[PDB]
Structures are given as C-alpha cells and as structure tokens.
Nucleic acid binder design. Sequence first.
RNA 1: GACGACGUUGAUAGGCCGGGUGUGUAAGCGCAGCGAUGCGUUGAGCUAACCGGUACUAAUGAACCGUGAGGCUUAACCU
RNA 2: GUAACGGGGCUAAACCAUGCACCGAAGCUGCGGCAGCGUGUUGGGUAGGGGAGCGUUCUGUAAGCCUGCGAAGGUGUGCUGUGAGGCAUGCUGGAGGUAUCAGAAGUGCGAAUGCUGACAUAAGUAACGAUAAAGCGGGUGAAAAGCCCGCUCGCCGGAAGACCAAGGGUUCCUGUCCAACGUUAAUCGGGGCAGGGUGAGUCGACCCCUAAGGCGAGGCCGAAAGGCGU
RNA 3: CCCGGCGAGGGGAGUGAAAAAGAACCUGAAACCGUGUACGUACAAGCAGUGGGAGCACGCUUAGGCGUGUGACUGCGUACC
Lengths: 46, 56, 110, 120
Amino acid sequence: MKRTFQPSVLKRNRSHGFRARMATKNGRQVLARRRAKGRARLTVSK
Amino acid sequence: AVQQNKPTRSKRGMRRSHDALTAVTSLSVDKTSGEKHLRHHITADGYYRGRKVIAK
Amino acid sequence: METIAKHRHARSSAQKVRLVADLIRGKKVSQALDILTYTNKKAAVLVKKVLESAIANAEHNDGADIDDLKVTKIFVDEGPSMKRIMPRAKGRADRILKRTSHITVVVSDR
Amino acid sequence: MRHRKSGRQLNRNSSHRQAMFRNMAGSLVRHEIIKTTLPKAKELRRVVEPLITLAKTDSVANRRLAFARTRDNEIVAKLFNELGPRFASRAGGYTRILKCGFRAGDNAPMAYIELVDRSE
RNA sequence: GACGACGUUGAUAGGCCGGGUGUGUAAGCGCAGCGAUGCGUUGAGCUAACCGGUACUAAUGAACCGUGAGGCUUAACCU
RNA sequence: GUAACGGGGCUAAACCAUGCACCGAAGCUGCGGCAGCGUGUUGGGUAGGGGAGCGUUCUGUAAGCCUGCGAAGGUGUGCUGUGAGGCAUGCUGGAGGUAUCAGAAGUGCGAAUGCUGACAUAAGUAACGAUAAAGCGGGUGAAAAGCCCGCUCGCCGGAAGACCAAGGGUUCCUGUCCAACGUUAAUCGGGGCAGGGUGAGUCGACCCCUAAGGCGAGGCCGAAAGGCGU
RNA sequence: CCCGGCGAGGGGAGUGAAAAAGAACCUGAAACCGUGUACGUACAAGCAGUGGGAGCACGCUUAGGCGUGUGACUGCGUACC
C-alpha cells in the first residue's frame, strides 16, 4: 500500500538543514557533537 | 512435518544407490565413411544408409 | 609413467560430477572419448575438455605413445564457494550457496 | 483415461495447436525440409498429407477448400502446379522423418522432416 | 519403471483405397421472382479415434553381457 | 493377540515330613602390590571440612646453556609412573627455546534457548515471481528457443500509446569484453572497460508583489536559558 | 612450447636454497568431502560397547601359538548434565 516515506527537498532542507540547525541552542549543541565525533557529513550536503 | 534426528553418511550414501548413471551403449560404425553415430540417428554431417541429406 | 591434468575452479557442483566421472574410470581413452562425446550433460563437456587436455599433455611433454593410454585415476574435489542472498516472504532473508569443483584426471599406459 | 484415443496435446490449448500446425505445414510446403522436435513431427504427418492428396485433382471447389486451410495463396499455388504432378503416381507416404539428436538449450529430441525426392 | 506384440523371411504404427457412421441438399452454373428467397444439376459435400486390404514412409549389416562338460564323502546298481 | 507359572513343558519337573551331596556374590580364605592410624586395626560415599601435587604465560638466577649437523609449532611410533603427565625418535617445519630453586597471575571448558567464524542433515527435494502464444529459413560464433535480418500467428488500444511536475543522477548514443550481476545458457543487457552527447530576448527558474506562516531593531514579560509582539 | 575459445585452467622449460613458497602466495590442525589397498556383510532385531573367540591378510623368527589390521559366533548390558 502507501508507504511511510514520500520524499521532497524543500521539506527536507527546511527542517533538517544547516541553517535550521543553527537557529536554536540545542541545534548548535547537536552540531558540536557531530563535529566532536569526526563525521564527514555534518548535517546534509547537496 | 520435520525430522527429529540427523542421518549419517551411511544412510545418505545408501539412498544414493540407484541414482547412478548408465553408459549409452548404442553406438555404431557407418559402413561407408567409417565414422561413428548413434543407432537410427544421422551422423554429425548427414549420412544414414549411405544417402545424401543436406550435409550442413 | 603417471600423467596429471587438473582443472581448478570449474563452475559446477561437486556432487553432480561423480555421476559422469564414475562412467569412464579404468576404460581405454578412445572408448572413453566415444562415450563422453554423446552424453547430454554439462559435466560431460567439462570432463571431456579435461581428458583431451590430458592426452595431449602426455603426448607432447612426455610422449608415452597415444594409442594405448588408459585413464587410471579420476576424481573431483570441493572448491571455494560464493555466498549470495535471496529474499523471501514476510521479510525473511536466507542465503544461498554457489559451489565450484576441482577436476583431476591422471592417465597412464601401465 | 486414454484408451484408444488419438492426437497429442503439446501443452497448449486447441486454437494455438491449430495455428502452429497450419504455420508449420506452410513452412514445410514452401521450403521442402525443416528441423523440428520429434513429437511435433510425428503428429505433423497426420495434417500435411491430406493437403497433398487434395492437390492431385484440379477442381475449383477443391482449390477453395485448399485455401480454406492454411490461409495462404502462394502456398496453395505451390500445390496444384508443382507438388501436384510430382506425386501423381505415388500411393501415400509423401514425407519422411530422420532423427538427428538433441538440442543444447533444453535437450529436446529433434528430427529432420523432408519430402521424398526434393528435386535437389 | 514393469508387462504384451512386431524389426524386411515383415501388417507394428502413420498414409492410401473401399465400406460403415455422423451432419443434412457444398461450390459453380441455369430458371422463376423488382427483392428477401425458392427450384434443378444431387440425399450432394465434408467426415477424430472404427472394419478390411495395400510395403508408399519409418522399424539399418551391427556392437555389449553370458563359456569351454560343472567340488568332496558315503551308500545302491551297471561294467 | 495366547496374556492370572518367565517360556518350553511335567502326572511328578506339584504338595506334606525326613535325610545325603552339589551349584550359588565384588562376603570369608590362599597368593601378589599400595596407602592412612596407633607389629595389629582401617581403606564405598552427595552437601561440606582437612592434607599433598601436575601443567601454562611472564620476572630474577641468565652476556649462563641448547640451536641451520635444524629452535618453537604440526602429524606417527615406542618406553615409564598410582593419576594430572614425563621421556626418546621418523616425517613436516626454517629461527628461536629454556634446566634447578624462588616470585606474580587475564592459569586448566562440554552444557548457561552462551558470543564470533567455518561446515553438515533435511536434498540435488519445494521452487524458477500473472494461463497475452508462438512457429520456420538466413547470418555471426566454440556453442543459438531466448541476440540480428525476413515470412506468418497472437495481445492492448480511455492503455500495456504520447507528453509534463515531484523523485532519481549518466541509466542516454557508439566501439569493445563475458570471470561476477540476469532465479537457466547469452555472442545479449539498464553488467565491466574506453570515447561522445544537452546550444534560448519569446520554454521554465532568476527578478517585482503578496495569502496561511516563520524570524523579528526598539518595547513588554521572565531565577539563567527564553516566551510574545510593532 | 603444447591443450584450450587469440579465454579461465593446467603440463614441460627457466629463475631461485626451497615453486609440496606462483601471487586466493610463511607454518596449514579440527569439523566436512573424495580416490586406492586388506578384511567383514544380503535368514537376522534394539544406547552400538565390554569379556571370550575361529578364519583371513601383512612383517619377524629360520616355525614356536610373536606384532599389526579385520571380527563369523557368544555371556552381560535402557547416553550426558
């Protein structure tokens, strides 16, 4: 039947992107943890 | 249904007794060219009773 | 003198070759080729290629005549296998096995 | 339960069987030699020969029955003009079968089937 | 798988020829009628498995398995 | 299914009373060996208590000893002790091993629906993913039902045809290759390798303006963080 | 150089101390799977052993009832935690 992931780009980058992660304080802490582990992909890339 | 124990190599080999093959034992020699073919078949290039079929 | 020709990593399961390899052990090489040419099996083609390798192997590098060879030793061994996956119903995933086999044929006159 | 019946089934329904045998008969009459599996060629003889014995007598009504089968016009013209007078002095048995071994894709027993003289 | 029959000195199967059965006036042509159609050539034409004849076609000369008078002792007959 | 002696079977091979022999255990004796406790007497044992030992890794004794005339490890044979075990040698192996007495432990595996890797039985068994259908001649090649060419047959036709937006990101075209992928073979492919390919004043985006809504200089409120709003 | 499809895969030659180190490359055990040799099995019932035991095959001693492998027949015997 109808599954649980119908993709989009605007709805993805609007609520998971780098700019929407710097809007809050907890998002900045999330980015700090991602940088502290050492991942190649911080939030998202094109 | 499912099994309850593991049969050995003896019973597994015993069941394979009659699953062996046989030789074809149906070869023959053509009376003209000396080449070989099965019984009641034409040869690789078309001789049967010494008569000429397409031979291709 | 003993003459060896083997064939590694053939693409057939090692149990399906003993049905054909059992037919020709101990025969003379010309009658073995006669039987082996007219069998409608894949392993027949494989082991016939092995035998025609072996007889020329004995003839050139060793001589050992030709008209009087007798196929003396022939056996098959398990080879390296490849794992694959095959999807099933209800999300179950089970693996399948692709097997190989090693042919060896030793011919002689003695 | 198959006691004194006749006719093979070839794992197909009836209309497909009729279409295949009409096509095969047309191809054999045109080419005078074909190479088909054994249980098809052992059944083809029951179909092709009544056409050849039909072709021996030249009547317009018989021509239109011969066109009613095989739905072809150069085939029926190969009859009545060349294949007619060739077997005009022969009582039955116009095709012959010779077995020719196995295939290499599915191991099916093939068989050549050809007319008696072929003029070739 | 097994069983039965036949392999050119031959009816084992396909075909051909005659018969039986089933269906119910084929095509072409002519006549009457403006036409639908009806009438004659004609119980015509076609006919799966049935019955009987017929070597026209296919069942090839072959190769493999199986031997060379069958142990000893004792008794009874013949020599 | 005999079935209320273990069976065969018995008129004594049943019962009652007496007598004479014999069979019968890891008991008692004769013979040989070990160990515990005061020449005697003892020596089966779960929960638990007490005593004596074997083997592995590392440290000192060790700039000592053995070793390419062959160390560790792997596979056999023979010998010894009461057991954990020890010793010698054939073959494989190609550069390390450790006597005696002391010391410290990541120190001894068969089970926990134990953890990781490898391999079996079920078994060459069920299955090969819409019941729209294929048949023949020619070419290529080692091999043709499945690829190319041609003749005939069949299916859809408000779709199983053609075009846009979201989505995917070289799958597009040509040459070349068949080990791996394709529920079979493949010369074939949306597979591997190498080269080539998208052209805008008028098509869309960019650009000007707003709706629901988000951020929001000052300001209001809040222990910090923050919440609402011109 | 030969077989093979101008393949995959091997056999000779050669380098090397060693190719039974040949690239999936030191040493290479175990479960699992084959080939050869010796003995045993197609009228006998069941935790597969144990005590007895004829024959056959292979080595020694110059037999000497010795060693190794097999086990017709037989008394007893219902795995482990």
